[PDB]
Structure 1
Amino acid sequence: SVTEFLKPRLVDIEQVSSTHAKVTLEPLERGFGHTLGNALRRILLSSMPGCAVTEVEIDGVLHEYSTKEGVQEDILEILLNLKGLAVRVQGKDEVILTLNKSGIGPVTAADITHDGDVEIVKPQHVICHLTDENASISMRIKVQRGRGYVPASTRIHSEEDERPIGRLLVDACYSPVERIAYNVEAARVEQRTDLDKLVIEMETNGTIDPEEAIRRAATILAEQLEAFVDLR
């Protein structure tokens, strides 16, 4: 109808795995598919709120360039694996998890004590490898909520507690989305035969609902475009 655009809407959420997923939005009118797909891809890859490990405190280790008697992996490597932990915090923004392990074997992400308001998407993610029988590792993990990539250098801008010795810092990559790829195909809707559907494939860490991610991206884009809608 020239001055009428058919309203796109969500029609399918194909959860291939706990992380990989495909969302489908249809119908679209002769070019809006590429525009919407590009906007959603550029918004999801940069402005997706998430949670990641921010601060680590080990019982005996006092700085990042030391080693603990018993662990097969270095403390720097331990923080490196901790950076890759995937977690979903529901209800609050700050969580202090506690890990306590003893005995020969790997330390997996299932050893963190249950918190109720915190869920672990990767329960078999390794952290360290205790080798001596009389070796025990106790860790306290401060996990925050945020967006983007905030290196530890920018998080020490203001000194409040002066960062007591023995408290290590790990750069946080708050983004829960790792890969986005959109594809625009032709779809049949009311025999128009000129309409397109958009399939967005998202590979995440499993801590984000793909439908929630799409709705969040659309909300961000609309909130930004309301300024142009007003235009002083």
Structure 2
Amino acid sequence: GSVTEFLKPRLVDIEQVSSTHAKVTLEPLERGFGHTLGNALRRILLSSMPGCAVTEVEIDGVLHEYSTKEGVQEDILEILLNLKGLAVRVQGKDEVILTLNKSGIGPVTAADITHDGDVEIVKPQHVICHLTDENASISMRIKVQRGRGYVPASTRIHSEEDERPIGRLLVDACYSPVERIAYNVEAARVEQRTDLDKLVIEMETNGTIDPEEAIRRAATILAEQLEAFVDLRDVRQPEVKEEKPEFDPILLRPVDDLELTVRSANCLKAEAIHYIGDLVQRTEVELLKTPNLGKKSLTEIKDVLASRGLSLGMRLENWPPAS
């Protein structure tokens, strides 16, 4: 390989006007590339950026998000809406539980939150509540996660926490840390040639991310995506899934579906019996030698198994095929 000329772009002065607003300048650029990289970087920055956001909030004495609380000028919905714009920067985790206790007259901000060593709060002046009477007190548990691209509570109907207590209030997530993204080409006075431009990228975030890792992660995504634009093997999918269940599909369900007593559930969870495919082929001989499993528990098992049609201690030496 031996062709082409081309040049290379590089980072110059990152003018940090404020904690939110920022300016990233790329000087070493030609004419075409200076305008081309503009839209690519802009889009990947206005969407495919990381950041942390609140997902779940559990407040004491509050069941649903349509309720109220004594000594709280703002309603629960407004409180959740305030927790939406909570500027949080987690060090090295994917999920953190920030506790927030505060009592007495006065406004409750993000400062009243227990200052964690991992959590870096941009604006501790962020309004969250407004306690009125001096005998009013609140204690809520906030959950912050790392994500990308919106994704509200409506997306997860119930694909998380099979039980999930009544108090837990799901809040929509605004993951992208970037508010606005602008860019200007502009002729570059590069003390060298004469026909070069300098892609000036005007940026405005929430302060929960720095322009360094921001632009680099963006260009990283662009590179990884352009990676598949090299070779074109045109790889197809094999498909052809097998359509012949050798056994009853119910044996693929866990023992939880049996709906039995807690003691028996713990016994099965201790005897390494996860699915009913193992309980269906386990004799009473082995069930008697199980810790804390008596006549009541054994009768419980045979009843909840026989009712579903299945039996106890059968044999089906075909477990499990065949992925």
Q: Same fold by TM-score, threshold 0.5 exceeded?
A: yes
Residue in 2 that maps onto 1:127: 128
Q: TM-score, normalised by structure 1?
A: 0.96
Give 3-state SS (helix, strand or coil) of 2:48's partner. coil
Residues in 1 aligned to 2:101 and 2:204: alpha-carbon distance in whole angstroms: 31
Give the secondary structure class of the aligned counterpart of 1:186: coil
Q: Distance in 1 between matches of 2:27 and 2:8?
A: 8
User: What does the per-residue CA deviation read over 1:155-211, in whole Å, with 9 as the maximum and x for residues that have no partner?
Assistant: 234253322111100000100000000111111224311000011111101000111
Q: CA separation in 2, counterparts of 1:133 and 1:161?
A: 39
SS at 1:155 equivalent: coil
CA separation of 1:159 and 1:97: change in aligned 2, threshold 3 A: closer
**C-alpha separation in 2, matches of 1:79 and 1:42:** 29
SS of aligned partner of 1:114:
coil
Q: Distance in 1 between matches of 2:169 and 2:84?
A: 12
Question: Per-residue CA shift, 1:101-127, capped at 9, x if unaligned?
Answer: 001000011011011011000110010
Structure 1 residues 70-104: Cα deviation after superposition (integer angstroms, max 9, x where no partner): 01000000000000111000111100000000010
Larger RCO (CA within 8 A; separation ≥ 6) = 1
RMSD: 1.4
Bigger Cα displacement from structure 2, 2-11 vs 174-183:
2-11
Describe the shift of the 1:85–1:159 C-alpha distance in structure 2 as closer, same or farther (beyond 3 A).
closer
Deviation at 1:31, TM superposition (A): 1.3
Structure 1 runs of 4+ off > 3 angstroms? none
Give the direction of change, closer, same or farther, for the CA distance of 1:157–1:58 in structure 2 (3 Å limit).
closer
Structure with more of its chain in helix, by fraction: 2
Cα distance between partner residues in 2 of 1:144 and 1:120: 14
1:181 corresponds to? 182
CA distance in 2, matches of 1:161, 1:125: 33
Bigger shift: residues 153-162 or 13-22: 153-162
Measure how far apart 1:50 and its partner are: 0.7
| CA distance in 2: counterparts of 1:65 and 1:187, whole angstroms | 56
What is the CA-CA distance between 1:222 and the residue it aligns to?
A: 0.3
Gaps of 5+ in 2: 233-323
**Identity score, percent:** 100
Note the C-alpha offset of 1:229: 1.7
| Distance in 2 of aligned mates of 1:52 and 1:32 | 34
- Provide Cα deviations, 1:24-73, integer angstroms capped at 9, x if missing partner: 01211111111101100010111000100110000111110110000100
Q: Give the match for residue 102 of structure 1.
A: 103
Residue of structure 2 in register with 1:92 after alignment: 93
> 1:6 Cα deviation (Å)?
1.5
| Residues matched between the structures, number | 231
Name whichever structure is richer in strand by fraction: 1
> Structure 1 regions of 5+ residues with no counterpart?
none
CA distance in 2, matches of 1:130, 1:45: 36
Q: Secondary structure at the match of 1:218?
A: helix
Q: Which structure's CA Rg is the greater one?
A: 2
